[PDB]
Amino acid sequence: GAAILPDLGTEILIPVCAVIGIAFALFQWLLVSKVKLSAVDHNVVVKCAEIQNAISEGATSFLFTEYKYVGIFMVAFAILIFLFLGSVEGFSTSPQACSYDKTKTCKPALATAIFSTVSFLLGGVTSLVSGFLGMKIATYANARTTLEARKGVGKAFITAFRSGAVMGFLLAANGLLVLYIAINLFKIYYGDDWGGLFAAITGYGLGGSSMALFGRVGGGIYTKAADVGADLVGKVERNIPEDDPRNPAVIADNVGDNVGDIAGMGSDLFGSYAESSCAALVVASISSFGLNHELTAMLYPLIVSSVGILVCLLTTLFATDFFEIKAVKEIEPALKKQLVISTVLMTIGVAVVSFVALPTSFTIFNFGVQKDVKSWQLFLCVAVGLWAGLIIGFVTEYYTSNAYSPVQDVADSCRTGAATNVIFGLALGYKSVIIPIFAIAISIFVSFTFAAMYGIAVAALGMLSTIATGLAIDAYGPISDNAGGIAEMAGMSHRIRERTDALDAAGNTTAAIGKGFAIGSAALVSLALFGAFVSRASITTVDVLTPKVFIGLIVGAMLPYWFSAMTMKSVGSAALKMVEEVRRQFNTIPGLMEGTAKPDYATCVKISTDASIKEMIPPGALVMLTPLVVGILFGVETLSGVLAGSLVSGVQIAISASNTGGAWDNAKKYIEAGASEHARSLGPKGSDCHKAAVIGDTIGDPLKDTSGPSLNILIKLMAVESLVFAPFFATHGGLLFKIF
Amino acid sequence: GAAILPDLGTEILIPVCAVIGIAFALFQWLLVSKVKLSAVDHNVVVKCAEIQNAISEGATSFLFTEYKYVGIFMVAFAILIFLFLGSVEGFSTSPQACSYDKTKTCKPALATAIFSTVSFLLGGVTSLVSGFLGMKIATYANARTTLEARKGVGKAFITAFRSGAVMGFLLAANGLLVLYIAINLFKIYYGDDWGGLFAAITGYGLGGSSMALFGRVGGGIYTKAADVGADLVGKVERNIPEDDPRNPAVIADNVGDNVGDIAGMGSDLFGSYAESSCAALVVASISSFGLNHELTAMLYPLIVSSVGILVCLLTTLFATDFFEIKAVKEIEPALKKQLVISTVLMTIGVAVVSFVALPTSFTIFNFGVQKDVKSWQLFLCVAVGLWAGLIIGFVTEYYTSNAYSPVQDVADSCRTGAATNVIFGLALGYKSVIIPIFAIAISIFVSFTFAAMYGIAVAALGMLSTIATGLAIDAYGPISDNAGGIAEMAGMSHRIRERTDALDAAGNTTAAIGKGFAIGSAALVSLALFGAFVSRASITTVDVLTPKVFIGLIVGAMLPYWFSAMTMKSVGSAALKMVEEVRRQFNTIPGLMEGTAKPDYATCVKISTDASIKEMIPPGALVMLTPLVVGILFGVETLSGVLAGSLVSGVQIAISASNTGGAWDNAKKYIEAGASEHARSLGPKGSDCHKAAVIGDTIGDPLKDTSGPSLNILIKLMAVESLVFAPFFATHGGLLFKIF
Numbered sequence A, B: 001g002a003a004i005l006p007d008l009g010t011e012i013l014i015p016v017c018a019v020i021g022i023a024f025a026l027f028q029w030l031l032v033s034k035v036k037l038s039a040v041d042h043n044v045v046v047k048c049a050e051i052q053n054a055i056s057e058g059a060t061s062f063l064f065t066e067y068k069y070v071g072i073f074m075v076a077f078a079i080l081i082f083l084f085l086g087s088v089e090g091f092s093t094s095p096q097a098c099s100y101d102k103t104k105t106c107k108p109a110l111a112t113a114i115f116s117t118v119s120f121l122l123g124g125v126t127s128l129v130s131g132f133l134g135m136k137i138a139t140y141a142n143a144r145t146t147l148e149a150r151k152g153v154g155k156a157f158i159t160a161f162r163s164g165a166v167m168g169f170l171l172a173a174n175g176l177l178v179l180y181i182a183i184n185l186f187k188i189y190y191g192d193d194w195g196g197l198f199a200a201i202t203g204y205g206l207g208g209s210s211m212a213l214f215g216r217v218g219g220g221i222y223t224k225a226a227d228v229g230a231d232l233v234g235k236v237e238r239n240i241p242e243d244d245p246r247n248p249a250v251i252a253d254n255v256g257d258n259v260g261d262i263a264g265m266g267s268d269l270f271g272s273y274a275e276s277s278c279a280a281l282v283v284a285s286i287s288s289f290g291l292n293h294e295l296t297a298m299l300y301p302l303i304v305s306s307v308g309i310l311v312c313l314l315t316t317l318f319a320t321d322f323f324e325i326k327a328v329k330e331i332e333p334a335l336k337k338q339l340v341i342s343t344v345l346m347t348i349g350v351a352v353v354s355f356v357a358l359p360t361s362f363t364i365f366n367f368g369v370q371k372d373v374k375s376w377q378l379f380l381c382v383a384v385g386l387w388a389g390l391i392i393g394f395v396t397e398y399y400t401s402n403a404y405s406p407v408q409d410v411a412d413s414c415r416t417g418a419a420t421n422v423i424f425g426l427a428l429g430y431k432s433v434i435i436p437i438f439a440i441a442i443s444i445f446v447s448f449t450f451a452a453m454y455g456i457a458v459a460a461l462g463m464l465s466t467i468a469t470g471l472a473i474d475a476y477g478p479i480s481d482n483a484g485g486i487a488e489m490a491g492m493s494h495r496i497r498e499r500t501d502a503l504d505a506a507g508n509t510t511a512a513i514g515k516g517f518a519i520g521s522a523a524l525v526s527l528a529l530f531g532a533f534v535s536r537a538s539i540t541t542v543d544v545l546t547p548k549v550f551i552g553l554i555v556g557a558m559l560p561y562w563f564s565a566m567t568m569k570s571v572g573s574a575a576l577k578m579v580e581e582v583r584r585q586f587n588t589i590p591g592l593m594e595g596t597a598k599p600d601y602a603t604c605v606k607i608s609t610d611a612s613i614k615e616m617i618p619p620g621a622l623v624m625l626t627p628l629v630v631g632i633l634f635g636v637e638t639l640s641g642v643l644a645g646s647l648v649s650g651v652q653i654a655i656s657a658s659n660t661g662g663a664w665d666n667a668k669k670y671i672e673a674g675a676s677e678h679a680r681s682l683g684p685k686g687s688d689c690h691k692a693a694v695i696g697d698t699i700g701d702p703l704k705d706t707s708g709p710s711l712n713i714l715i716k717l718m719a720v721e722s723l724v725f726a727p728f729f730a731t732h733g734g735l736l737f738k739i740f
């Protein structure tokens, strides 16, 4: 029953590792501070800092506005959680038999309605902090990356990567510490009722993904309205460089990288980490670990995350200290080495944890039955998710980097115009899904076989065990992106812009890899939650060949398309207005095209701000309302169908959308760099091939930055939301069938 | 027990209705022959005939080439069916107990192996005939429609529509008659073993869809390679009219309409018809109808189809006789009225048939049990499919006709360039899936609840009960497309082309509608076949939450994307070759752009011929091999997951792709016609808006004509293939699990 590592060791180990992670993060923010700049060569440093401030102000301003709406919605929804969950036992204050063991007595369900609302708000707040902190580091390091670019690629790379690491370790450590705290606080009330305790904790993931949904969508709309509008009028119509200070949309564009690609992404991944941890905990809570009250083994998922931070710490040193980039061709291999190193070290890490934090034999809850599991099997569950992640990263890099043929072929197809560029890009994205799906399927088979829903949850966490590194190589990208925009806006040398362009291109690839991990883990966690939901709702079998389940399956499969329709149309409409606005200033403001006059940046920011705040509402509504509407009107069988179908369907469109968009971007970068003869043959900038590439790039903008990455949230959010309201649905739901 | 309609009446009724349909088709073809031309103004009639002969030669030529390969594949695969089905009982010649009644003896499994091979070849040949006949009428009607356009749209409409009705009535009647004959011939052997009789008949739909798959994909690649190449160079680069006789790709483009949009589509719909009928027959064969040997009720689906032929005949008269089109805005409502009338009349026809051909009480096989079912409930099953169809057509028209807001806004977005046009078109397609899915889901729920798999199968057939009319309004479109092609190549009046453009625009909408009907019925029949497969394979329960089923689900959901990756890339690569070749002729043939030298049409025909014949193999292999590979390696429960997954997933991408392509085409047509102030302001032809619209149109070309429409075949083909091989898989499959 007991492991080698005693409960008190666990209670110490977790927050120690968290603090080590925060410590490391602050240490990296410190080093990045060594780069000095102020708005008070010398003219360059002053201009860079002025631009950084405009961006830092715009990003802070939008997030405050966005988080305001989202926080209000957060509060409203929390009221629904309390009400709906409280209504199950008529708000009784009396104890009841345990849902998991009739012979025992548990804390009243109304308590759980209360601690669920508590953990929901905890998660929601931690999610906003995750996004906001990320924006803070990014809007700090961007111009510092620009300035270090004067000294070479390797130096600007380090600044950007150190800064990515700040965000990665802060998110990973803060998310772990809040959960640890919440579990220990909650335990004070629950005592021996670990079932109710971890059922309450489940709201944490629900809160995390709930806020992330609006952050990803809202930020996504803001950024891509500007991106499309700036690039179309500037590069395609007016023949001026990307990020040219004459272009009124450039401030919104570069703000957008921080507000969407950074803030939205940070929340997103926090949601992933939280739901994965919660799912594991919820199944363990009614397995031998939870039933025999064994704290160490019970917190196996948090112990894994803990070691993950230390592993990622050692890994990061390989890129900041033990090596330096001399050639631009070294950048992408550097970033990929981060993944390989962490995966290898963490395979050793998890072996150790599995050896010391688990009994050699235990049981796992398996649809009403205690299944015999061995710790070496649980090691394989974690590890399969971990290696599936590496596989997914390798495949994604293959399809999105311009160092390989798929993207080079897409760039090449620009010789025959924008239409062929788009057909090839679409085809590439569709093609890209094949290996990720097999990886995910293999992970499911292995983990489902060994340890049912617990194994699957713990494979999700395995895929996210190295999340600090993952966030690092991902957050590195938009920082490099802003760095290039700043360089250009500060009229710096063409040689500076070339360095950042190389950093940026690698960042396009790592952003796609980040999305791969998000989609991979969302598939796994959603399946685990789905299985948990099925038990919690007292369903005997989810039989596909029943009218209730099947209509759910086909409708569930349709939801990701509905969601994508909304988000694509929003960006399209906003971008249309942006283009019309940028054109207006070019056509009416005297001397703007000449460099005489100043553009009005604030009107473009307003277009994307208005569009995002308004248009993020319906897609958020669709995802949040779906489980409630289906569960209440149609019942838990039909919701089971919806969950399965949205999972298997949404994953395809998510992967293809992200990779297509990533590919179009790097095909365009390929042409812009002119780093080979083939590349140079499609140039120079302004050529018909380059313009065709830009068309493809801007089509991919909403695909990879608005709809695409948000779909992983649509899937995991509905899953955890369904689990949380399961007792309510199973009691007060299925109405259309009760009355007819 | 017995129905009002006696068994011998049914035996007479069915073929009389087939003969009436064939007679009607010949009559209409006879009327169309009144339009005279020969290649022996007078110059205009002669030029039209020469162009018609070039197209006819090209189309007959490609199909002979394609059908040769496909026929060779068909003979190969027929052998596989014999061996695999034969091997289940070691090719024993001894009768065994009826699986549906242990007290009776049945014909040997070997007989069913033999007769399944026979029905497979029948369906395969019937499918090729359907496609070839369609091509023969279209390549006869095309120039006649052009000549009739001199007298106005109404006259040209009549010619095109009478001709489409020729194809529709031949296909519906020939498919019905062949099935009726095969059943009667097979009955000579099986006698009272109706289980084995109809199990053998299942090969008919298998053969139908097998050949359709290659017809749709091969023809699809052929036509779009040419279409994209012609349009991009001619319209976008060289600023010449669409279908300009100086353009070397134009002949291949117009041959393409006959070879894909007609021959491929004809085979496709035949497969839908065959499979839906076969699906209803198998379930009935072990329900009360087949067990009590009640021929009239057993042949209920064939009686529904027989009455459908007559209903469609009457409906046809409203468009050929009782009304004349006098203005362009009447074309679409006329075509829409065909759907409404046929549906209203067929509702009555089905009520009658349910009244006289069914006992008021009977039982339907329902996963091992006999479920009590009333004739009025079965009427609702057929009717709900019939009505789901109409809904699908109405919302598809809303999303693809430029008479409505969605497409006009797509056109409007061209004002900001090709990138916004594509974002809008993609969003439109995603958005379009919502209502059809709901219609399909409602159809499934109603029919599943009332009569299990039989009800579902019969709902699919209900959706295709008016298939003669469906084919007619669909086939009308490519004929009108050629008509304008010919008008332009013959150098006719601008007013002629304006008329054909109006006809052609409506054809874009009905083509989308036809795909809507194919997808809808594919979903229903695939579900029915999936349910049948499950029983035939002795699966107790398809439980979503098992490792074997779930990996099937997520992999199945990925196949439609893999399929689309291949077909999209094929068209893209072939189009790239086409663009290069068309550019070469304009750039190097002295006098070509001047109209004094003739282009080399044969070279473009060669490029799309070589690409299609080659590239149709891998997507065909993917669909055909998947059930074999999954069934033999992983087993029938995994295959269950694959069937469910490809169904719910493929259906979304099929609908969005077809409607997006349709919308881009008609958005372009709206600009090209300038029939309103808004349309005019996007023009004239050659404007940046028009060119942006052409870019979108050509991206939509492979989406709507190669990948999109073929996915309905991927879905329904795998379902029938799995049912046919079910006893082989159940017995000799799941190898990986057997060795480990």
Ligand SMILES: [K+]
Pocket: A477, A478, A481, A504, A507, A508, A511
């Ligand atoms: K990026």
Ligand SMILES: [K+]
Pocket: B477, B478, B481, B504, B507, B508, B511
């Ligand atoms: K058409």
Ligand SMILES: [Mg+2]
Pocket: A227, A228, A231
């Ligand atoms: Mg951009």
Ligand SMILES: [Mg+2]
Pocket: A227, A253, A257, A481
């Ligand atoms: Mg950016």
Ligand SMILES: [Mg+2]
Pocket: A481, A482, A484, A485
């Ligand atoms: Mg940028």
Ligand SMILES: [Mg+2]
Pocket: A481, A504, A508, A665
């Ligand atoms: Mg980028």
Ligand SMILES: [Mg+2]
Pocket: A227, A665, A697, A701
């Ligand atoms: Mg971009």
Ligand SMILES: [Mg+2]
Pocket: B227, B228, B231
């Ligand atoms: Mg065309």
Ligand SMILES: [Mg+2]
Pocket: B227, B253, B257, B481
């Ligand atoms: Mg055509």
Ligand SMILES: [Mg+2]
Pocket: B481, B482, B485
């Ligand atoms: Mg045409």
Ligand SMILES: [Mg+2]
Pocket: B481, B504, B508, B665
């Ligand atoms: Mg068309």
Ligand SMILES: [Mg+2]
Pocket: B227, B665, B697, B701
């Ligand atoms: Mg076309």
